[PDB]
From a paper:
The pyruvate dehydrogenase complex (PDC) is a central metabolic enzyme in all living cells composed majorly of E1, E2, and E3. The 2-oxoacid dehydrogenase complexes are a class of protein complexes with acyl-transferase activity in metabolism and amino acid synthesis. They co-localize 3 catalytic components (E1-3) that act in sequence upon a substrate-carrying lipoyl domain(LD) that is flexibly linked to E2.
The analysis was repeated using native PDC data EMPIAR-1048929, which found a highly similar CBD-trimer distribution. The CBD of N.crassa has a trimeric interface with a symmetry axis that coincides with that of a core E2 CTD-trimer.
Author numbering:
A (entry chain B), C (entry chain A), D (entry chain D), E (entry chain G), F (entry chain F), I (entry chain I): 226 to 458
B (entry chain C), G (entry chain E), H (entry chain H): 264 to 349, 392 to 425
The structure:
């Protein structure tokens, strides 16, 4: 006793692509933990001084910090062509939107020279059009880096993702959690404080990137996130 | 705007004793009222905050920066009790009702174990 | 008893231009007072977490806030031509540099999509080249808004400036000072606090701009400056 | 990259007029600070004893005080014609109304012999008709003095305005603010009080008016405003 | 209903001159605030040790300080002729006297090498002759700087003035007022003190002077006024 | 034993007129009591801030309040002609001046659009000319309402007056007096306060006016008097 | 400017008694001077006004409006007595002479029936 | 910046006596700490100035004029002692070292001959 | 046993001159004591508000005070010619500089109309050139008054000087010293205060000057010195 359903035409188009990525790009992973208390405080401060114009989220902050880190270390903002390496100077980020019909790949352009409001508005307009199924092809064709977030589900601590064919890196974000940290109380002792953290995983190709480059990339991202004011410069 | 009340008994024998004794050794005679106000002053110094407290812009800005990384869990107040004994009662909204209680017990302790404290 | 010095060739090139601006552009001014305590705290916080890479100043913050305010109200980012109005979409700011051979106006491009570090580096490279007298002509030809600062002299509280020929607005910044303000002390009373303020004057042309537009422009600049975190937004 | 918009027919009708005013009328400005606590108390006292008949505002008080000050010093209630000076005996005030189709100037007549209720009713009927675009030409042709207010925007402390062609003065009002003042406490000491003030700027032509006349005009206006009961006198 | 008065012969002689100044000299203004408590104490100390020989005023102090500041920065003590710049070495100041037949400008010579008594005696003799209408023409023909004071009217906080044709600067003085300042009490805290201040405005031409030169001029004037003993130096 | 004096020529001119008024106009009276403490306080406040320009009195306040009440209820500002009713739009008030030669009837015009100072100056100039016997006939011919005051004599509590031939109303004012009133003391009891009051009588014709109209007229007058600030609007 | 003086006797026995007694039970010894100043402070709190008092602009304006419809009949002061006993004298103009008296009797009562009050 | 220290012994018996006695006659019990602070307050009132003191502009201007022709030789301070007994020590630079001593002896006198003074 | 040295050529040129002065000008002396505490305080106040521009001394103050005293009493600013008296209107002062080669006589011009800084700069430039032996003859030819100071040596209390041939007065200044003076302590007693004083000697010719004139001259000098502020007027 069982049932069989014919394979969809669109299911092979992604199956072949996924099968090509693994056999074409060696993978190596890097993990880190980020404290995001200050970022939450900033967001709360900036989401109450408004009258209804906008509303922000963590993903926009991560996108902007990604752009800055890409700028400081440009070797990740590259690509592997037939017989030559391609190096860019503009950062385009690919965001993943899930719908019952499948997974899309909206794009955001000019992140380096942009603010949070425009990024949010673009990500939401594109998410709406992706859900409503009137997306032009040029709008989801190519980027430099890809991001995935699963913070809506508290049961996902950390996970991995596959790199897209022409790209050389991808980032995966988990859900927040709480951990104990040591605090030097002014009385001259050590006490327990409760910090909130997220675990970030990055997958890199080893033909265009090396371990040290990825480690430096993670360091710049962390420095930009833990200290949020540095998002200005 | 729902409102609620909190109450606590009281015994004023010790204050009477201190007043009488002071009257016999020096000559100073003062009313119970000053004891009541002075106890109220020492009480409204260290009272917890409502669990539904919303901060202001300056507070969040200073945290986002790093000057006051250690937050606060205390805040002064301005309460005035209601007369009575064998009781002290207060009427306040629901949100602060709990904070208003820390006040009643603090005065309830000082006035029964520290009446002498409210003298000069 | 007196002495005479021949007029310089460059002094009439500027004399004729200044004499043309007054008779070609009616002027109306607007003044405001800005509190900059939070901006100074921010600058101190961001100038100590560095190791020597950069060093910031108030002018960069004012330039970025100017760009944001220009974006929200685009009627000022315009120009008056022979028989048509010119409206731009990119903000270029003209900064004034004083030298013994007279003042000069280095130009900064792409301010909207930029950070404080790049703005500071550009303003300082151009200031150095202006002082050393090797400036190309294309580098000081045209912008949309002009800024002047005199905070190096504590004796200048507020002052006025002349608008450039093709532009339709100019901003003048004074030196800081201290004033008394009311503070609601937690005890339930009102007390005196000592705030530090600057007085900003803006001169506008009345053929391309109206009073309400200038008032709104000043409001957006003030909102962005008093709340500095909104510079990210 | 830029965009162009054709100049409107009505924009040159005002551009030429503004360009004629600057080259025809030399300008000199005078500034003053007025305390308006007593006026606010009066307004609150007179806006609560009513049942719905009316509702007042600061502009009406300033208009009436302007009329009284004009009456005491008549040299400002004048005009410069081709070869003769024109001196009036009735005070007509021009109020400015801003609309998307540009600003407009409704006119109020017989202010000297009038009360606050009639002035408010006229200013509001004319503001409504100006907004609805059914204003007759005779209703905005000529006056003796012009007033501009920007107290709706708290970011405007003080500003300047251009004089109309046939008139010889204009007044500009800013937004309120708070300052410290000395109070002689009954105990026999000096203390700090927080007063609310507005900054008023007046622009005058120097062919019909002199500095002393403008200074006296400002003095009469200030005396009438700080002591509000004298509005009856 | 109205009245007409023929234009006076002397009113056009001044109307044409004022109309020529605006179209011939671009204007830019600078403002500052001066504390004059120490100057008032000095004046009280020097007006009581006399037996009737003299009596001083603030204007003489400002005139002498103006002369010193002119000496330190000589670029303002200049003039713009047909095709040559004129630079002087002696400071002559023009004072304004108002009369019903219009304003007049008595002149004081050799201010740099002079004392307060001679300046007061000259200013009062010339004021008397100006009021009595027996002034020779040579006595009001030319100077280097012009001053205007309106401290007789407490309702004038700050105001602007027009520059004379052959001159390149003018100073306008307002009336005193009181403001709060911070004082470091000897107990180790900060307190409120009530200082008395005046607001001084200076109007400059931009063909002979630049912004930095005017700012330095204001700085020298302020330094000489706040510290009054330096008047000897 | 007795004496006889021939009747004067001017005594019949008034006797006939008085005899015609009674037989031509039916009369009905209305009385009210007004509290005037606040009015006295206002007058004291406004008679001390002056330097000698003017000096006010109660009659001017009553005249202005009359004008306002006439404006609100226009049926009293009318007249009865041969076969048609006359309704006006301007308020002219007739004041009574007593002289040894007889009783005059000076007139004041344009009361609605006027201030207290002008009313006082007119009433005093006319009183002087009436006393000096050089009054033109046109100056005492017709009005709309007539007023009589006898507050100089403390022995007159209330009295009646006769209406003039062409007019339809007259007002009579008495002398002040003191009465007890109840005050709700903050302790929660009732106490005695001493108020000062005047009694005002109004005589009306019943062909042009009815009882309700007169009652409303008295109500408007009372409301304007007890609350004196309402004299502004 | 005519001037006049007012005088009143005094007895300082009770203050002496309080000082001596306090010295014997605790050790505190203080001078008569502080009693004099402290009595002067409690006195200059509630003193009537001269019958020829002229108000100011703010006062009349607030009355004409309706904020302070209840007027005032008291006003503080700053007096300093002159030494002496078996007397306290003050020199003041004629207008206030009467007000200066309310001060003398108020201190004359407190210092004779309330000396203990001026202790802490 | 050379630094130096100054020291002085102390005896706290009299303060103990006053505290005990006060506890037996009224009920008030207070710690030694308030005695220490109150003595420190009365001390920092009249302390000489360093011999190498340089004046400011306002001071010289007022002298050059004639308002304060009599100069000053005293100035307040803000000191905090260090705990200890059988000793009180302070650490200060060389210039003020001498001034810091006037403070130690002043407190050393008041606390041994005037303990009662620090009571209400 | 002894030694002989031939007389120098320059030693007779001064010997003859000195021998001519005594036999041509009768001499009479006048002495006075001056308190200079306030002057020292002023100098300290004015030598600390500078950044290195200048540095003052007592001699400049004495020179300026001399000039003022000369102006008040002009009979000393004169000279005795063959058969006529010469009276000047400009004050030139001769200062004495000692060098191993002999005694020079530098000159300062225009002291009346000058400040302390210029006087110091001139006296120091001339002292340097006198020490370096490149002094032009015109620079040490004639003056009106001569001054000598010996305050560098504490052992000189008072001394005399010889008058120059064409001049009619000379002043000699000693070294400071300390004396006791009475002070009326506020407690109502008399105490001892320590004042610092200098002794000034003046030598005058009796053909051009009399005793009373010299006494008045000394009085003006003393009044100007003890009260230093009076150096302004």
């Amino acid at each position: 006793a069982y049932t069989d359903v014919p394979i969809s035409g669109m299911r092979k188009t992604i199956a072949a692509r996924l099968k090509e990525s693994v056999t074409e790009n060696p993978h190596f992973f890097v993990s880190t933990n980020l404290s995001v208390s200050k970022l939450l405080k900033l967001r709360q401060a900036l989401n109450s001084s408004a009258d209804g114009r906008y509303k922000l989220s963590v993903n926009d902050f991560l996108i902007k910090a990604m752009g800055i880190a890409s700028k400081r270390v440009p070797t990740v903002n590259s690509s592997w062509r037939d017989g030559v390496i391609r190096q860019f100077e503009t950062v385009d980020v690919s965001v993943a939107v899930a719908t019952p019909n499948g997974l899309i790949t909206p794009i955001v352009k000019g992140v380096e020279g942009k603010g949070l409001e425009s990024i949010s508005a673009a990500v939401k307009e594109l998410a709406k059009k992706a859900r409503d199924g009137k997306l032009k092809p040029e709008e989801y064709q190519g980027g430099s880096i890809s991001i995935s977030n699963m913070g809506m589900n508290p049961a996902v601590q950390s996970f991995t993702a596959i790199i897209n064919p022409p790209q050389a890196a991808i980032l995966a974000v988990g859900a927040p959690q709480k951990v104990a940290v040591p605090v030097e109380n002014e009385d001259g002792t050590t006490g327990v404080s409760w910090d909130e953290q997220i675990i970030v995983t990055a997958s890199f190709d080893h033909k265009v990137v090396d371990g040290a480059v990825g480690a430096e990339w993670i360091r710049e991202l962390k420095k930009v996130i833990e200290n949020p004011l540095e998002l200005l410069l | 705007p729902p409102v609620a009340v909190v109450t606590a008994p009281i015994s004023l024998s010790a204050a009477i004793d201190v007043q009488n004794k002071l009257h016999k050794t020096i000559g100073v005679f003062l009313p119970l009222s000053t004891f009541i106000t002075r106890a109220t002053e020492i009480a409204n110094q260290k009272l917890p905050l409502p669990a539904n407290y919303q901060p202001t812009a300056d507070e969040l800005f200073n945290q986002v920066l790093g000057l006051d990384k250690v937050t606060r869990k205390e805040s002064r107040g301005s309460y005035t009790p209601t007369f009575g004994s064998f009781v002290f009662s207060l009427q306040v909204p629901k949100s602060e009702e709990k904070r208003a209680q820390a006040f009643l017990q603090k005065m309830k302790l000082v006035l029964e174990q520290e009446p002498d404290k409210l003298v000069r």
